[PDB]
Design an enzyme around this catalytic site. Structure first.
Site: not given
Ligand SMILES: [Mn+2]
Ligand SMILES: [Mn+2]
Ligand SMILES: [Mn+2]
Ligand SMILES: [Mn+2]
Ligand SMILES: [Mn+2]
Ligand SMILES: [Mn+2]
Ligand SMILES: [Mn+2]
Ligand SMILES: [Mn+2]
Ligand SMILES: [Mn+2]
Ligand SMILES: [Mn+2]
Lengths: 377, 377, 377, 377, 377
Positions: C87, C92, C96, C157, C275
């Site tokens: 990848r 960004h 993450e 993405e 959540e």
């Protein structure tokens, strides 16, 4: 005496310092019906709870979305002019609708083709000024006091475009060039707005009419509401003015409702848009039914603004000894209501009975004719 | 007598039906100071103008962003409990701050580590419940009446998460599995919320304390505000509780202000955030200075909510014969103000004189010590 | 057989063409508990219902606010890499967080002081990359498949900043000047992104470590979640990683929950934030209690995303024959829950009895110790 | 001569009336790099394209979100003061950061504990005023011209809270009561704001210092940026001031960058927040890389504001014969950047080679040391 | 067998637990066309993935903006009624459009002039109820199952205004006064809504018609769509109902499309507004072309909702062995489409050839006649 928020075995006495005078004005809010339920936005505001702008010649106070946030689409000004006093030539983005409560006044308007309309308005008369067209108000020998409604809730009467304010903020050399005059010839122009100012009474209306090369306006900007035949029912009267009869009034529909003591504006809703209310005189209560088992009751009296969001069920009951008089205002090109009584009366009786778990003794009283104001028996 | 919106040669008598009682309550709104100017949002709302929810055991009414739209970040509930009555075990997203105006009550809270805090609160005491932690209130032998403040203006007390409501909307087989019991053992669970309900008075606080394996909470959730030493000045007292002394109170800072007759909360502003106000007793006026030559004056009395947007200049003057008592509430971790007097006192005198076009006779009276409440001479 | 939306004397057979396979997956939605009520937002979405981006070397698919609009603050990518596949180096705005479900991979990150961290991650391990720091993923000899979570629901993405994309849209003369090389020396740079690309397997981790003049990073960007001691209770296990133990993970708190057949994640809520859920394996149902008598039950299985808005009450029940394994994800610096059982256990028994209309036989079963996963008896 | 939007066989001559002077200023916008692509928001605005407010004593003009809508979080004022002239004592909600480009000035500030800070600032010095704390500026014998930055893009310098404006809109009887004076003693107060006004030069700084009972401020509100040791690299210098060294400057981080002719601020991005730029002198171009194959190049020169949204890749190249000097401004508590060169230098060389399709001849030139400004070879 | 996300040398096997049944339903999402690209919002949602409200007499489930956020302007309910069962008399702000998929039902509506319309609707028939007009549905001897579409995406069927709910939340004394009855005569009114309830089958339609003093409604509220002549082309049929033929249907335009096996709804777009889709039977795929090189393919089958934002290019291909039947719904007063084929056919052939780099052999096949559904050759 001293009211308390007690209903049977529910509630309790107030133990902290309190506003007894406001509590006495709001009996159905201190002690709501047991049928109320759930969170509902505030639908009630008093002009007496607003700042009054005082000028030489009158005053103005307003109820806007900054006071009553449910009313995003409509705002209102209560304006008063002394005899002869002038609300300065001005314009604004919003359309303006008016009801003359007290006295009389002369209005002017000029349209986008340069055509002039000048007219006198008395008690019970209306005007409507479309968006952006410039206008003025001058009270006659009794003075004047009236209600203005604007079709944007964010309006403020402090933010109109006034003739002298515009000129005061335009370069003098540009004004001079615009009219073909010298800067010296315009040296006495005001340095600031006038807004409202005292003035000698005008002459007769006929002597003020201005003729011009573009002819008469195609539709009048004033309307004699109380000269029309009302819808009369057992407990009161309804006078409607919308774009189907007051032709220029494209964005405001209105009804003046009078409710005798012991009577009520019947259970109904509006299938087109929100209702904005002004209580001219008397005392009322109204329950707003908001769907999903939600309902809240409000009290109103002279000087109050009310509101009913789009399609919510409601009634307006006179709870005093004098007539109840109020305005129903809508941002639409027509007035429309659905009557609960007439709705059920126009359905098969056994179908209504299956819904309500009531018998023929109830469906027998339904009326296929709409009676907007009913009287208690 | 009959007040009129007349100030010298400005204004006029009211000619339409009107609310004289509200006009008498709002003298500085019917007749504002000549120094007011411009459009300013409404900063004033009465609990008496709200729907009161009545239950067996007490009542609750609220002022939220749906009533007072300038107050987007803070809302409030006026709640009353009869002796022994319980505000049902519940929780909510918002943090909750409280001031006990009348009577006394027992509160419980359990934190996210399973630690229990149970305490009695009397007149002048506070509590603060952080977001989401579950709690209850039970009035003692005098009953209780108190002010709640929540740190989101969109709150509604009708929308809390209540113990019995949660259980009533959970499958019985899941409840049974959760606790290791049979469905028959839980068959008597309520089918709906209780919210507020009557109950026998509790026993002594010491007999209610619950011990547990996770120990004591690190900081208490109650505070004795009126047991603290206040800031005392010529005309009154200020008691401050924020996260620097009431340690758990991370999102609400508060001050209780008392203003003697003939005194005033001095000219000041807050450099950190908006002010939310509750008037416990007495009568006041306040001018809010909003920048760009805008200012509007409001009247307040017992039962009223007020507001001052972030950094706007203001004072609070007692205009009655009794003490004026009100709360200043802030959504922040500390209380902060800047005093106009102290600001100018801490600058070179000739620099202040050059700004104000006044002489040494004025700069000589400035004080480098902050006096939040001053007395008229 | 053929399920039907019938519950006792309520509901009816489906008469129109229908999706029987989805109905079989959603038994508690075709036939909800009678305790459900009211409108609740959708809390469930399948990765199988998303477009899969296929590349030489793997694939990626995502569930974002454009799929599940209740989840405004969190979005997720399911990414798969073949052995050795990369990848591409990228960054960004969003932080993450990752959970390695299958296989293993090597990650790189360089921080804003130029310090390098390179590490291998296996099944049950995590990583966390703070906002804007650049990173890469390369699968090892088994390939890799993992779940990524980003702390903005609007993420995609397809919109990362990739090394070769940046260079392809920078003037060649600027690249040349930046590195002190000729345009001819960089003539072979890619003309477009790579995103995911096949590559030979790397060597041993020890041979890849890069030393530098700025030293080691102060905290590691990977965490061995399944090597920690879990909270063990009767019916399963909970492994928590938040900023108190996985120090860099400042904006994401996480728990991996395993629920044996016949067990359930107990009734609880979170007092800090929403959540977000991912179901790794097994089959579940969950009722979300939304206040004001509102509740809705959802079914989940492997590949599904779930959600519980801030403070709503919930449980997660295993309704299958295999273990149920899912992730609880929070945008906060810590994990926090309140257990319904522990809450009531830490209150006076007669006070709980007065709420629930149950006796000592019920309060006797309450536990002051928190057991996040309980087993049916 | 006459530039044309032609690049090889792309583009054409302009055939309509045009702005040749602006075209000459924007060579990389009339003829962008072939590597630009896609829609990108405008990132460039000139103070010369704004209305200049002229007063006796100086001027002020501003670039806000109403001019440059991408910059929602930051706005700026270019203010000029003649010798001795005063920017009137005032405050505002926003924090204020400043860079002294020309001349010198005396500032005052008083904090919320009544502590006074008075100091002189010269060329290359900064100040920072936290939200809501009141302050003033007075130019010394050279006059002063400086850049102000406010941490809300909706700011306007016409909307500050000024001392004399507040007093002019406060009832005289309230002012009198506040200070313990008569209305006659304050009769000479200004009737309107001053904003900027001429004044005699002040005396020495030491004679203006005001002592008080609350002691010295804990941290200074001024900073000598150009007295610090810069980061020096081949092509220029970077001077950083953020909350780690200029302690009070909690919401604004800043860097002053100087770029020699033939040099460039290297390819980099910021992992924390948006960049706001002011070009003090010289001429530049910058390409902003916006992800997903989008990039747009902008030209800047003295007097221009620039912007780089959060994490977008960029460089700033000197395209003129004189030094290029500009400010990088961030709404954060620290400065942070990631260097493209240093990033790749801290990764395994074969891994970088696999991404870029280049060999060891390229990875050999990478530097593990960060050089913010590089020089063309 | 077991599908995998592999396309030639792109993609890989799934290594984590997965939803094979959903993957089999979504072949063009697990393995999209290589011509897809970029981020596109979700355009697909199943009624089987929604909570079903079960009542004595039927059920209702809904797909709203809370499920499918791209569809802000339109929402839908799938409602089922047993023989004789009644959907309670009610109204709402939104206009309502309906398609009868199974069975038959009797509807009532009363308009704002008190005029009654009562009619029976069978399979393939429509109704349309304008905003706010009150209505009911009663299934006949086969029961009924139908699709409702509302012209606001935020609608919920749990939030209608129902007759008995309104009455249950109105003071009994007000109801009594409204109809001229005693409180005792209305004591048996329901205490809560009915919503859907069982009832004996009605009699013949002719015996239910109610006559009244206000006459017949000017336009019918039902329409026999499948009795109209369709647009027939090689591969299927299109039946259109909009305000030009179904006169009352002012805010909803609709088409029922049937696509034979081996056929497709041709490449087209809509120049007026967004398309909302319901798949009645069969299996489809559709690629949505979103401009700027973005496109995403979705799979649909019976029970699915689809969406095409305003003017995006699309086709709908039958990918199964049975006819494909779906609805195209638009919030507008007319249906409009542009056919890609017809567009190019109506242009000079050499101009089309210059665009497509194809010759006369391609432009020779274009058709100037629009064929909405074409058959594969
Ligand atoms: Mn007007
Ligand atoms: Mn009405
Ligand atoms: Mn509470
Ligand atoms: Mn204050
Ligand atoms: Mn990443
Ligand atoms: Mn949870
Ligand atoms: Mn300033
Ligand atoms: Mn930068
Ligand atoms: Mn309906
Ligand atoms: Mn279409």
């Amino acid at each position: 005496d001293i009211p308390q928020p007690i209903r049977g075995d529910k509630g309790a006495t107030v133990k902290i310092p309190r506003n007894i005078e406001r509590d006495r004005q709001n009996p159905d809010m201190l002690v709501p019906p047991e049928t109320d339920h759930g969170t509902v936005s505030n639908m009630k505001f008093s002009f007496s709870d607003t700042h009054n702008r005082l000028e030489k010649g009158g005053y103005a106070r307003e109820v806007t979305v900054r006071e009553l946030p449910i009313s995003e689409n409509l705002a209102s000004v209560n304006m008063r002019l002394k005899p002869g006093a002038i609300r300065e030539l001005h314009f604004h983005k919003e359309a303006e609708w008016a009801y003359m409560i007290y006295g009389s006044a002369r209005v002017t308007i000029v349209d986008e083709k340069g055509r002039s309309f000048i007219d006198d308005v008395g008690e019970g008369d209306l005007w409507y000024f479309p968006s952006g067209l410039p206008h003025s108000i001058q009270a006659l020998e009794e003075g004047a006091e009236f209600l203005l409604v604007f079709d944007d809730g964010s309006f403020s009467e402090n933010s109109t475009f006034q003739l002298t304010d515009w000129l005061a903020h335009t370069p003098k050399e540009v004004i001079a060039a615009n009219f073909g005059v010298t800067k010296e010839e315009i040296s006495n122009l005001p340095g600031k707005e006038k807004y409202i100012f005292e003035n000698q009474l005008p002459g007769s209306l006929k002597d003020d009419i201005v003729e011009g090369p573009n002819g008469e306006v195609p539709y009048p900007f004033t309307y004699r509401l109380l000269e029309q035949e009302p819808i009369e029912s057992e407990g009161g009267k309804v006078y409607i003015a919308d774009s189907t009869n007051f032709k220029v009034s494209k964005t405001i529909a209105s009804a003046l409702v009078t409710v005798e003591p012991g009577a009520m504006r019947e259970l109904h809703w509006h299938p087109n848009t929100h209702e904005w209310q002004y209580y001219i005189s008397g005392k009322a209560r109204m329950t707003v039914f908001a769907s999903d088992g939600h309902a809240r009751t409000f009290n109103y009296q002279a000087g109050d603004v009310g509101y009913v969001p789009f399609a919510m069920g409601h009634y307006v009951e006179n709870i005093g000894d004098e007539p109840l008089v109020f305005l129903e205002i809508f941002k639409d090109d027509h007035y429309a209501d659905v009557s609960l009584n007439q709705w059920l009366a126009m359905l098969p009786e056994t179908f209504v009975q299956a819904h309500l778990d009531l018998g023929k003794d109830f469906t027998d009283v339904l009326s296929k004719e709409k009676h907007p104001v009913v009287k208690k028996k």
